[PDB]
Amino acid sequence: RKRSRKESYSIYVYKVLKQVHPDTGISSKAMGIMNSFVNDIFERIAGEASRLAHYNKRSTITSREIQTAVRLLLPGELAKHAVSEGTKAVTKYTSAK
């Protein structure tokens, strides 16, 4: 009866997939790939933010730091669009409390 609990990002990837291509499915291996990919990007960004924080003797990670790290790690137009989405997200979240 003993049973563990392993979390993932699967269900959310499935949601996004159904949003962009309703008549399409995805296999377990690829979902695992996407899971590992998400984990990798998460680790890179958080580590980079940490390094920026530590270099400026600031003890708080904010949206600003994330934005900076994004501009550092990713190239060009991808950065700009993603940054747009992030800013839009913050503007929506901060208003409709």
């Binding site: 291996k29 695992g32 790939i33 590992s36 990919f37 984990n39 990798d40």
Partner: protein, 86 residues
């Protein structure tokens, strides 16, 4: 009798398999001396990675090498691997 299959070692990584691998890279024509050198190269790569993996294994007081150890050992060499967790 002397088989020890061809060396009981890397030489089981047979020639036509290396040929197929070179075919994946778009290559058309291969020299006869390539094979052995490639094998040596392969060994070195494996050696380094396996060493690191075994080291991770040694830290947890296990006798079973898990996939995670291979992933991390590959990540430190700048050859991160996706699709096996992490």
């Amino acid at each position: 009798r002397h088989r020890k299959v061809l060396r009981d070692n890397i030489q089981g990584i047979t020639k036509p398999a290396i040929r197929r691998l070179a075919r994946r890279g778009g290559v058309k024509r291969i020299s006869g001396l390539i094979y052995e050198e490639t094998r040596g190269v392969l060994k070195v790569f494996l050696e380094n990675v396996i060493r690191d993996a075994v080291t991770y294994t040694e830290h947890a007081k296990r006798k079973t090498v898990t996939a995670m150890d291979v992933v991390y050992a590959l990540k430190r060499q700048g050859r991160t691997l996706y699709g096996f967790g992490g």
